[PDB]
Design a protein around this ligand. Structure first.
Ligand SMILES: O=c1c(O)c(-c2ccc(O)cc2)oc2cc(O)cc(O)c12
Ligand SMILES: [Br-]
Ligand SMILES: [Br-]
Ligand SMILES: [Br-]
Ligand SMILES: [Br-]
Ligand SMILES: [Br-]
Ligand SMILES: [Br-]
Length: 275
């Protein structure tokens, strides 16, 4: 699939940089024709077949195809796509309140504050999983706040760079996210399904409640070994006044066997979450 090949600068003015990763840089921008503001994500293309620098066209097209499907208050939306020799440029919805990660670092939350974030995350993931989309990279840096200066910030899930359609219940690809947040089936290179996201949600919940990462070791290999062994516990110093029901919720997500793990529907009916 090809994208708009006119110069993006003829239609948009860029401003402040929002952030950058290994292959992407994201800049605030403003569309000239409407005055409306967006986030322009520049993804560097691969320069040759075999290269490791840049993102393969297959991977870029997958991300764009998935983004085109989605319209939900808790997930980032796609406005337009441009490209030139060097980059594909995604014009995305602007979410300007920063990462949930940075929000956590500036402030543990109360259980109310934690569940207020978590419920939005669950709703976004319920939408995605209902469309058979696995995100595969859920973590606090991929949750963006609309406005961080309100008591209950609204959030949107971003970064669909590892996302896949799961049309046969599982996928068997080169898929590996951030060690602190990946499920054991990812660590063990096994077929992956929607269940992997639910594990990541368990890790996020543990962090929201305690300010500590449940599997984090001194090196990435230690973290991955910890994940595979389900080597986590609820430290009393962090969890002494946390409700047992919140611990139960986490415990039913951080389960090695993806078949016994709570699904997104299970998580919405769980007594800690259900109204
Ligand atoms: O740093 C990042 C970032 O800030 C954003 C972003 C911010 C506001 C938005 O409205 C949309 C995206 O996305 C990203 C996507 C990546 O793949 C890598 C990144 O580093 C970021
Ligand atoms: Br700006
Ligand atoms: Br579902
Ligand atoms: Br993070
Ligand atoms: Br994004
Ligand atoms: Br690590
Ligand atoms: Br699910």
């Amino acid at each position: 699939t090809v994208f708009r090949q006119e110069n993006v600068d003829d239609y948009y003015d860029t401003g402040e940089e929002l952030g950058s990763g290994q292959f992407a840089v994201v800049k605030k921008c403003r569309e000239k024709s409407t005055g409306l503001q967006y986030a322009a994500k520049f993804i560097k293309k691969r320069r040759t077949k075999s290269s490791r620098r840049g993102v393969s066209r297959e991977d870029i097209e997958r991300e764009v195809s998935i983004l085109k499907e989605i319209q939900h208050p808790n997930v980032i939306t796609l406005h337009e796509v441009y490209e030139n020799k060097t980059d594909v440029i995604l014009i995305l919805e602007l979410v300007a309140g920063g990462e949930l990660f940075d929000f956590l670092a500036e402030k543990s939350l109360t259980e109310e504050e934690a569940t207020e974030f978590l419920k939005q995350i669950l709703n976004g993931v319920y939408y995605l999983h209902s469309l058979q989309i696995a995100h595969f990279d859920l973590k606090p840096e991929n949750i963006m706040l609309l406005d961080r200066n309100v008591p209950k910030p609204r959030i949107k899930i971003i970064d669909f760079g590892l996302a896949h359609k799961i049309d046969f219940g599982n996928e068997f690809k080169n898929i590996f996210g951030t060690p602190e947040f990946v499920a054991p089936e990812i660590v063990n290179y096994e077929p992956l399904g929607l269940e992997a996201d639910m594990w990541s949600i368990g890790v996020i919940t543990y962090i929201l409640l305690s300010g500590a990462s449940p599997f984090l070791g001194d090196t990435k290999q230690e973290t991955l070994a910890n994940v595979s062994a389900v080597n986590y516990e609820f430290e009393d110093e962090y969890f002494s006044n946390t409700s047992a029901l919140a611990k139960d919720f986490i415990r039913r997500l951080l389960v090695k066997d993806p078949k016994k793990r709570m699904t997104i529907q299970d998580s919405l009916q769980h007594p800690w979450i259900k109204p």
